[PDB]
């Protein structure tokens, strides 16, 4: 492979430069916007995923599975990341910021909110965020081993350089990884919402894969 041969700093580099761009936006109105945005971000996600160390080492069939499984999780952690600085609202696009007064979903809107404020209080860093995202891609459909261990080292590496103590390092790790469970939760609930709106072919094929 290749991923396992990367140092912590290289791993961070590879990821930081694989980062997809932040896209701009263009019940029936709001969702048409999210699906349109989501659809366009998917293209960028596919090519970003390939730039994730270890992902290329997967067969096409395995690569398709992880993305079908994790994509909405990928989108959501990104959204929450964009929304840190904007307490109380969600920043899908710089020109698309929505409050809970519009989501009427509202419960999901809240969970994403709480998730963003959690990143804020933890002062989640970009390098930490890129690691977490690569983790969601590799782990969610995993049911990768040694590739995931590597990112762990990378995360600890990042925290250590930040000046954190031995104890602090392992509880921030814990805290961080615990949020993926919630993001898995929001994704599944969201996937149910997407399904009821269906009672683009790509987004439809993505939804069907999950059901």
């Amino acid at each position: 492979s290749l991923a396992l041969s990367l140092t912590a700093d290289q791993m961070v580099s590879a990821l930081l430069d694989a980062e997809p761009p932040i896209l701009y936006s263009e019940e029936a109105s709001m969702m048409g916007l999210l699906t349109n945005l989501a659809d366009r971000e998917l293209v960028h996600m596919i090519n970003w995923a390939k730039r994730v160390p270890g992902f290329v080492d997967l067969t096409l069939h395995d690569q398709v599975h992880l993305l079908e499984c994790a994509w909405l999780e990928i989108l959501m952690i990104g959204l929450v990341w964009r929304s840190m600085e904007h307490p109380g609202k969600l920043l899908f696009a710089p020109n698309l910021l929505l409050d809970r007064n519009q989501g009427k979903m509202v419960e999901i809107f809240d969970m994403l909110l709480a998730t963003s404020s959690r990143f804020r209080m933890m002062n989640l860093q970009g390098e930490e965020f890129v690691c977490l995202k690569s983790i969601i891609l590799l782990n969610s459909g995993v049911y990768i081993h040694r590739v995931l261990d590597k990112i762990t080292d990378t995360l600890i590496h990042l925290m250590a350089k930040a000046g954190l103590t031995l104890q602090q390092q392992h509880q921030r790790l814990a805290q961080l990884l615990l949020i993926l469970s919630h993001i898995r939760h929001m994704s599944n609930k969201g996937m149910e919402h997407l399904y009821s709106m269906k009672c683009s072919d790509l987004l439809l094929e993505m939804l069907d894969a999950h059901r």
Binding site: I46, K50, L60, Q63, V64, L67, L202, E205, M206
Partner: peptide, 9 residues
């Protein structure tokens, strides 16, 4: 499957 295509090129 579209994902099959996008992942190739």
């Amino acid at each position: 499957k579209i994902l099959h295509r996008l992942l190739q090129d």
